[PDB]
Amino acid sequence: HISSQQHEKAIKSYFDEAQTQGVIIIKEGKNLSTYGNALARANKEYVPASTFDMLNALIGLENHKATTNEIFKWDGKKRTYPMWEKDMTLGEAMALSAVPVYQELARRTGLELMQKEVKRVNFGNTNIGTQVDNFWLVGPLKITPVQEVNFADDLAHNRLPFKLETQEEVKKMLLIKEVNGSKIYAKSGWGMGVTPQVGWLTGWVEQANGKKIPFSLNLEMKEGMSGSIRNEITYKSLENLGII
Ligand SMILES: *C(=O)[C@H]([C@@H](C)O)[C@H]1C[C@@H](SCC/N=C/N)C(C(=O)O)=N1
């Protein structure tokens, strides 16, 4: 039916219409596909921002710094967003992208064990510097869209070097949507303290029949852009390609 020239044009147009520059990478089996209106972003490094929450949670659970039902208490200080002003589990923090919880979890892990775990997993440029609580927000940790989709593919298939149960626990935190028998698992990201600002949505689709299709959207966020544009472009793309 639909030519690949048309698929490429439809998906480029989604990014064009949002007046941003971005790419979305799809992986089917071993094969990577790059779509969007800025294909060269695919092998450029950007801060992972909140997408790091996935690995942060993996490391924390594996090293017994937390459990999946522990409540991280709000310390009562004003937060950037009122939705963060409450007690929550890692899983709720994952859905709300509650940075203060992931910061508390990074601190419990500590710089030393974090650096080793990040090197061990080979995540991005694997460099976390000297500040345990912000390396994924302002650098020096960086990662490419290709690396992110490969990380997602790894997690989707339990290939990261953590126990199966750790991986399963983190994955259950990432379920964001069901669409005609397809389950979408994803982590969003928005690096507000870098110039320019980077937007992420990294995840996979689990189809009815069990096949898992990893994706990673990467784009430039601009002042007065809605966060849900990351989702809308992703769903439109995955739908255009008949993945969902
Ligand atoms: C991670 O990338 C972010 C951190 C650097 O600030 C958080 C902040 C949110 S913005 C709106 C929050 N609403 C969530 N339900 C965000 C994001 O949308 O990814 N990531």
Residue numbers in the entry: 32 to 275
From the article:
The CHDL OXA-24/40 is prominently distributed in Acinetobacter baumannii and is characterized by the presence of a hydrophobic bridge comprised of Tyr112 and Met223 that covers the active site. Class D enzymes are distinct in that they utilize a carboxylated lysine as the general base in both steps, activating the catalytic serine residue in acylation and the water molecule for deacylation. To better understand the structure–function relationship between the carbapenem-hydrolyzing class D β-lactamase OXA-24/40 found in Acinetobacter baumannii and carbapenem substrates, we analyzed steady-state kinetics with the carbapenem antibiotics meropenem and ertapenem and determined the structures of complexes of OXA-24/40 bound to imipenem, meropenem, doripenem, and ertapenem, as well as the expanded-spectrum cephalosporin cefotaxime, using X-ray crystallography. Two deacylation-deficient variants of OXA-24/40 (K84D and V130D) were employed to capture acyl–enzyme complexes with the substrates.
A predominant conformation for imipenem was observed in the K84D complex, although there is some evidence of multiple conformations of the C2 side chain, suggesting flexibility of this portion of the molecule. The entire imipenem was modeled in the predominant conformation at an occupancy of 0.70. In both the imipenem complexes, the pyrroline ring adopts the Δ1 tautomer. A single Δ1R tautomer is observed in the K84D complex, but in the V130D complex, the pyrroline ring appears to sample both the Δ1R and Δ1S tautomers. The hydroxyethyl group of imipenem adopts a similar rotamer in both complexes, although in the K84D complex, this group has noticeably tipped away from Val130. In the K84D complex, Val130 adopts a “closed” conformation that positions its Cγ2 atom toward the imipenem hydroxyethyl group (∼3.4 Å) and atom Cγ1 toward Leu168 (∼4.1 Å). This “closed” state results in the observed shift of the hydroxyethyl group of imipenem away from Val130 to avoid a steric clash. Comparison with the imipenem complex revealed that imipenem is again unique among the carbapenems with the conformation of Val130 in the “closed” state, yet imipenem is turned over approximately 20-fold to 30-fold faster than doripenem and meropenem. To reconcile these findings, a structural comparison reveals a unique binding mode for imipenem, with its hydroxyethyl group tipped away from Val130, avoiding a clash with this residue (closest distance of 3.4 Å). The smaller and more flexible imipenem may allow for easier access of the deacylating water in the acyl–enzyme complex where no clash is present.
